[PDB]
Design a protein around this ligand. Structure first.
Ligand SMILES: Nc1nc2c(ncn2[C@@H]2O[C@H](COP(=O)(O)OP(=O)(O)OP(=O)(O)O)[C@@H](O)[C@H]2O)c(=O)[nH]1
Ligand SMILES: [Mg+2]
Lengths: 80, 97, 73, 96, 443, 81, 102, 73, 77, 48
């Protein structure tokens, strides 16, 4: 009847398989947020993004393409 | 009366629980070459269960004291029984004083 | 070496998380890691104004978690 | 670690800690870890400005602690010597 | 039961908290005997109390007020009387002998009085070095003993609250002669400290009955079809224990030296050239440190006096709970304004048989030396107001078996030795304060 | 490893600007491979504060911004292992 | 070299350590020391460092002699400061840029 | 359908022109030819694009690992 | 790190990352430079507050100094 | 001077085997129930 615990690494792995768009926050930059498709990650969860657009508080989207986001900055990972 | 055994309960959450390390002494075996003899010596009479001592003098080792500290063997003649008893009496007097 | 945080009592409960920079997120905890990386489902985000925007499934880095709070009596 | 041992000693008492924000927490410590992650109860939060709020159950991550005010009567807690391999300060009886 | 090792268990803690004490030449220390008669018969006859500070698995220090009871059948007075001012029972069972008649009696009387029980399976080393059972048969023997104890519990109350099982952290495996007393959690933590980060509770709850570990999948199975896996407890606990004992015993200096070097246990070269038994004691005291498993089990599964005040008041106290005295008992107030209520269930001889010490548990209030108290007998009531005796308090001590710690005053929730009030007390008595509200009731 | 260069040099006056911007000036007693530096008879100058001297003082390794070494040191020889 | 696995014993850790300066990003400090080139270094407090690098660490802990250090900040005024010798903790480094001597 | 991990992503990108972003607003352009395990990187003929404007040329650049925010193009 | 031991039971002032200063008697320290101070006073900005028994984080600590010395034959023929 | 000795495990086992005729085989001490020293002292005192 209990629900099985899911560790975060498997959560990101699942997101990788489902190709779910994500909304990545940042460590201190509150207003800048990044979105795109996740394409690869490591144990330190450096995130390799696809279709990375730099969305802002006023939705000032800017196309960044495929980028590597160093793990030190990701505060939150959103599912769509 | 337990509804679910603690065993099935323990397994049923995260059946894929994993631990990578091995027990502490893994390459060894629970019985070595000299284990049987070591256990035999562990429960031996006083001189033989030590491996370290202090080299008593030659005359300070009685070698047959346990023969008469125990009971007399049965079916012995009268004089032997009396000898057992008298040696025991001398030992008791020695210990009392 | 490292050590597993004690959070089994907080699993599958309405929990409130404070992040760095005065962030605040609701949700029910669904997992945790060695570095206190947590996973939330059906969570809700608060802003400074206070309007509640549903945020979704969430995987916060543990480095940013300030506190984890529950409200039940 | 002697400081972590004293923190564990605190468990069950009322300890005040302030985090990297500057807010101080007044409550009963119920759990502690080697990382100094703490669990608290009946907390009276005093923000940096001075506003007083109240919390019931918290799990403060240890990396964001500045210091703690341990109850005074713990100044007599024993500081055991720690050998090389031991990870907890306890009375010793073996070689070292 | 008799000679099952309950005094050796307390000697184990005393050896650690008192560095000056050393083992005797030809026998066990048997600290907390302190009677020339008991040292002659080599058995406990009186229930000597002992208060000392012990350390928890994580480092917290508790104040264990343990009372050592006799194991002989005839001396059950010394078990029942101190058990009325105690919060739980620590049951020591010899694994080789098993559950005996006195163990059964203690279990029945403890469950009958709603006392939590912590089980200690003593003399484990006899399974390895004396009976020479293989690890699997040893596991079966331990499990059979625990099942027998649980049966004796169930004969009184089938409640699931009273249940002893290692997976509940309620059972300690010990060898007080060799000097270790661990639980499932103490080995799970002992593994974890060495090998990194895995939750101790999740690991420890999977180290009991017929949960099987598969060495290739690294997962805990349930049945282990054919012989793919071996029982988790045997794989992770009993087999390492056997190998430790055998490495020490079997005269393998270099292998043991290397293995203890891996554990950062370093011995002087003369130490390997020791008698087998002190070598085992040294290895076990360096490998297993302070017996923190027993301390953690006792702290978790035996309520503190404040938490146990309600049960004590409901069971022992016979007056009305709604009164002022009853309320003072339930809150266990420590302030001076509170009524002083103490229960005396024992009297102890001085080092010369001249005067007695009253062994009391301060249920509420405060007591200072020189305080005026009125002593209530075993049958004092509204009909019989003539059993009260007004008496002073001469000296207050904290018992420590072979000595006493004198304290100017004592506080609620403490077990203290009272001097100066012994003349009117035969058997049991209740000591309340004179300047108190009317209608004092007895326990 | 190059921190060994720190403990090869000892007992000489050095000026340190710490991580907070403060400046200290004194002779080292001993420095650590883990970068804990011990200072004696030093000159404590807190940023935006009046300078104050103290007899002995120690820095945590993370707080060292840089050093100011004297010019009387055999730098070439001191760099060898 | 074919050992970036990051699970290595001491010998191969040292081997990768030397190879990293043999060819990796930190290699620039090697020939900067050998060729004695001007390098401009910026700290995290907006301070400028120009000097020769006599030696450097794997943590980029560099010893600098003959430093030309300028910091800017009333109206924006630029000021300089020359220190004969300094030890720099690699923690504060944001960037290094080499000025070729030739 | 083929996931590319960070280290493979950077080593399969050696010699290509990229725009690195720092934590603090500076973005640099150039070509990289050397990245080690700790992901601090070296550039050639790089220039400093403050606010997205080409002000000065720097040449070859050593960037410490932590200071970057992301890398792309 | 043998010098670190020599400051036990001394009175120390510790300047912190925040900018405050704690003065008190050192009871025990740690590898991460966690300091345990007894009868600790807080130097904010100077205002005096009694704190008591205080455990410092390692990161919080910037520098430390000592203000006070540690508190305190047979026969012949 | 011969004041302390230290023997191996094989050597002690061999000596135990070689002198097996002249040592007891009890290892229990419950054999001497009323036939131990203190019982003899008691019997001497009571004249039984
Ligand atoms: N082999 C072995 N012997 C033990 C162990 N623990 C205790 N003993 C021995 O058991 C005997 C009885 O020990 P005691 O401490 O007197 O036991 P007890 O429960 O106090 O006996 P009573 O006070 O009469 O109940 C002594 O010879 C102890 O040395 C053990 O773990 N292993
Ligand atoms: Mg006893």
């Amino acid at each position: 009847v209990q629900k099985v615990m899911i560790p975060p690494i498997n959560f990101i792995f699942k997101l990788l398989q489902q190709h779910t768009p994500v909304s990545i926050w940042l460590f201190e930059q509150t207003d800048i947020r990044l979105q795109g498709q996740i394409r690869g990650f490591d144990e330190f969860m450096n995130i390799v993004l696809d279709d990375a657009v730099q969305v802002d508080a006023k939705n000032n989207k800017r196309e960044l393409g495929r980028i590597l986001l160093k793990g030190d900055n990701i505060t939150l990972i959103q599912a769509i | 009366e337990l509804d679910t055994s603690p065993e099935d309960s323990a397994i049923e959450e995260d059946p894929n629980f994993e631990i990578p390390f091995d027990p502490f002494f893994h390459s060894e075996d629970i019985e070595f070459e000299h284990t049987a003899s070591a256990l035999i010596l562990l429960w031996a009479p006083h001189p033989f269960n030590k491996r370290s001592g202090a080299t008593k003098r030659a005359q300070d080792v009685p070698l047959i004291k346990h023969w008469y500290l125990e009971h007399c063997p049965p079916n012995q003649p009268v004089k032997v029984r009396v000898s057992y008893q008298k040696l025991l009496k001398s030992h008791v007097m020695n210990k009392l004083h | 070496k490292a050590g597993a945080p004690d959070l089994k009592k907080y699993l599958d409960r309405q929990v409130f998380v404070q992040l760095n920079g005065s962030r605040k997120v609701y949700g029910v905890l669904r997992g945790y890691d060695i570095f206190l990386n947590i996973v939330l489902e059906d969570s809700i985000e608060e802003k400074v104004d206070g309007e509640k925007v549903k945020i979704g499934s969430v995987a916060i880095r543990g480095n940013s978690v300030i506190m984890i709070e529950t409200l039940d009596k | 670690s002697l400081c972590i041992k004293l923190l564990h000693e605190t468990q069950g008492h009322i300890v005040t800690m302030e985090l990297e924000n500057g807010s101080t927490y007044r409550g009963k410590l119920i759990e502690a870890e080697d990382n100094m992650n703490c669990q608290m109860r009946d907390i009276s939060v005093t923000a940096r400005d001075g506003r007083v709020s109240h919390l019931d159950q918290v799990y403060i991550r240890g990396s964001h602690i500045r210091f703690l005010i341990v109850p005074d009567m713990l100044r007599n807690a024993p500081m055991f010597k720690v050998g090389p391999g031991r990870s907890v300060p306890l009375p010793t009886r073996g070689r070292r | 039961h008799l000679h099952h090792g309950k005094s050796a268990l307390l000697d184990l803690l005393v050896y650690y908290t008192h560095p000056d004490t050393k083992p005797p030449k030809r026998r066990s220390l048997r600290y907390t005997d302190t009677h020339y008669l008991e040292r002659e018969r080599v058995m406990s006859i009186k229930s000597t109390p002992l208060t000392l500070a012990v350390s928890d698995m994580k480092g917290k220090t508790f104040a264990f007020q343990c009372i050592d009871t006799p194991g002989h059948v005839d001396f059950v007075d010394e078990v029942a009387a101190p058990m009325a001012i105690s919060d739980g029972v620590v049951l020591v069972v010899d694994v080789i002998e098993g559950v005996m008649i006195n163990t059964t009696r203690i279990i029945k009387h403890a469950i009958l009085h709603d006392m939590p029980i912590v089980l200690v399976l003593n003399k484990v080393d006899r399974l390895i070095l004396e009976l020479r059972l293989p690890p699997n048969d040893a596991y079966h023997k331990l499990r059979h003993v625990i099942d027998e104890v649980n049966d004796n519990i169930c004969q009184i109350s089938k409640d699931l609250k009273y249940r002893v099982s290692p997976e509940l952290g309620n059972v300690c495996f010990a060898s007080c002669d060799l000097g270790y007393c661990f639980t499932l959690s103490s080995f799970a933590k002992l593994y974890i400290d060495r090998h990194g980060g895995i939750d101790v509770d999740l690991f420890s709850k999977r180290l009991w009955g017929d949960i099987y570990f598969d060495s290739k999948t690294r997962k805990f199975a349930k049945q282990s079809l054919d012989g793919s896996g071996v029982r988790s407890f045997v794989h992770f606990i009993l087999e390492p224990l056997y190998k430790l004992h055998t490495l020490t015993i079997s005269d393998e200096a270099e292998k043991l030296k290397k293995h203890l070097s891996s554990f950062q246990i370093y011995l002087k070269p003369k130490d390997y050239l020791l008698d087998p038994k002190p070598l085992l004691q040294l290895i076990c005291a360096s490998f297993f440190g302070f017996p923190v498993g027993f301390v953690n089990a006792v702290t978790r599964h035996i309520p503190s006096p404040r938490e146990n005040a309600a049960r004590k008041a409901s069971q022992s106290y016979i007056g009305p709970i709604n009164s002022s005295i009853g309320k003072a008992i339930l809150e266990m107030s420590r302030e001076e304004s509170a009524p002083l209520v103490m229960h005396v269930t024992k009297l102890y001889n001085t080092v010369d048989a001249n005067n007695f010490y009253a062994f009391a548990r301060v249920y509420s209030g405060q007591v200072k030396k020189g305080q005026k108290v009125k002593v209530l007998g075993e049958n004092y009531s509204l009909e019989d107001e003539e059993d009260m005796v007004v008496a002073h308090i001469a000296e207050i001590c904290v018992p420590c078996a072979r000595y006493r710690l004198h304290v100017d005053g004592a506080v609620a929730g403490m077990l203290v030795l009272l001097g100066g009030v012994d003349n009117s007390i035969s058997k049991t008595a209740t000591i309340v304060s004179d300047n108190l509200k009317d209608d004092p009731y007895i326990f | 490893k190059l921190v060994r260069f720190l403990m090869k040099l000892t007992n000489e006056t050095v000026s340190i600007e710490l991580k907070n911007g403060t400046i200290v000036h004194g002779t080292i007693t001993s420095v650590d491979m883990q970068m804990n530096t011990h200072l004696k008879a030093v000159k404590m100058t807190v940023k935006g504060r009046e300078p104050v001297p103290v007899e002995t003082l120690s820095i945590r390794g993370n707080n060292i911004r840089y050093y100011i070494l004297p010019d009387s040191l055999p730098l070439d020889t001191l760099l060898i292992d | 070299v074919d050992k970036p696995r990051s699970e290595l014993s001491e010998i191969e850790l040292a081997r990768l350590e030397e190879y990293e300066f043999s060819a990796g990003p930190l290699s620039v400090l090697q020939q900067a020391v050998k060729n004695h080139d001007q390098v401009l270094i910026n700290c995290r407090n907006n301070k400028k460092l120009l000097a020769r690098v006599k030696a450097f660490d794997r943590h980029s802990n560099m010893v600098l002699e003959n430093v030309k250090e300028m910091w800017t900040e009333g109206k924006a005024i630029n000021k300089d400061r020359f220190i004969s010798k300094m030890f720099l903790r690699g923690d504060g480094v944001v960037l290094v840029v080499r000025i070729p001597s030739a | 359908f083929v996931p590319v991990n960070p280290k493979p992503f950077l080593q399969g990108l050696i010699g290509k022109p990229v725009l690195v972003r720092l934590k603090w607003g500076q973005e640099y352009k150039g070509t990289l030819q050397s990245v080690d395990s700790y992901m601090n990187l070296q550039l050639l003929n790089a220039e400093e694009l403050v606010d997205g404007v080409k002000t000065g040329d720097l040449g070859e650049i050593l960037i410490r690992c932590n200071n970057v925010l992301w890398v792309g193009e | 790190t043998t010098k670190m031991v020599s400051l036990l039971n001394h009175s120390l002032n510790v300047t912190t990352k925040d900018g405050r200063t704690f003065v008190g008697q050192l009871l025990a320290f740690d590898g991460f430079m966690n300091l345990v101070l007894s009868d600790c006073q807080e130097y904010r900005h100077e205002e005096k507050r009694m704190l008591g028994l205080v455990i410092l984080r390692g990161e919080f600590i910037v520098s430390l100094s000592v203000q006070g010395p540690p508190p305190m034959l047979l026969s012949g023929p | 001077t011969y004041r302390r000795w230290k023997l191996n495990l094989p050597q002690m086992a061999n000596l135990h085997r070689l002198g097996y005729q002249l040592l007891s085989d009890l290892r229990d001490d419950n054999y001497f129930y009323l036939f131990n020293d203190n019982s003899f002292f008691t019997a001497k005192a009571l004249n039984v």
